[PDB]
Amino acid sequence: MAHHHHHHMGTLEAQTQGPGSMISGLNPTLRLFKDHKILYSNMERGLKPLLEVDNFINKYIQNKEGLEIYDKVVGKAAAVIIYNIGLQNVQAGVVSQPAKDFLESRGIKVAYKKLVEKINDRAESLIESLENPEEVYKYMIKRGIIVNNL
């Protein structure tokens, strides 16, 4: 038994396709992981840096909770910033002694390298309570170690 079909006009009107993507041979010097698995990949310089992905962590990263991060150099600015982000699992290539100390002191599990005892910054010998990142942040402007440029 066959069925006779009733014909119908297509009448379709589609929309433009979205943008593609690009890579850089420099590779993501900044990175986010979950269960050591690559969650996200980013640069600290260029468009959408470590500063901007911080400036909306909550909005960009829904899974901020218990997440891991990777950076280049944990200086004073990177110490205050990582503390501002509030991540418990971090990795870096290099780290300043007061920075590594502060991170491990907050109970942040970190993987990084540098053999030093003291970075010559006068805030250390002046400020009694190294609890508040805003005290050192001002001196961080004074020495200008907020910009990653030697």
For the record, the structure tokens of 30 come out as 């900044």
Angle at 67 between CA 70 and CA 77, to 5 degrees: 45
> Phi then psi for 102, rounded to 5 degrees?
-65, -45
Q: Across the beta sheet with 109-111, what order do the strands follow? A: 37-42, 30-34, 68-70, 89-91, 109-111
Q: What is the 3-state secondary structure (H, E, C) of the chain?
A: CCCCCCCCCCCCCCCCCCCCCCCCCCCCCEEEEECCEEEEEECCCCCCCHHHHHHCHHHHCCCCCCCEEECCEECHHHHHHHHHHCCCEEECCEECHHHHHHHHHCCCEEECCCCCCCCCCCHHHHCCCCCCHHHHHHHHHHHCCCCCCC
Domains annotated on the chain, with CATH: 30-143 (3.40.140)
Rounded-to-integer distance, Cα 16 and Cα 23, Å: 23
Cβ 30 vs Cβ 71: under 8 Å = yes
Breaks (C-N over 2.5 A) in the chain follow: none
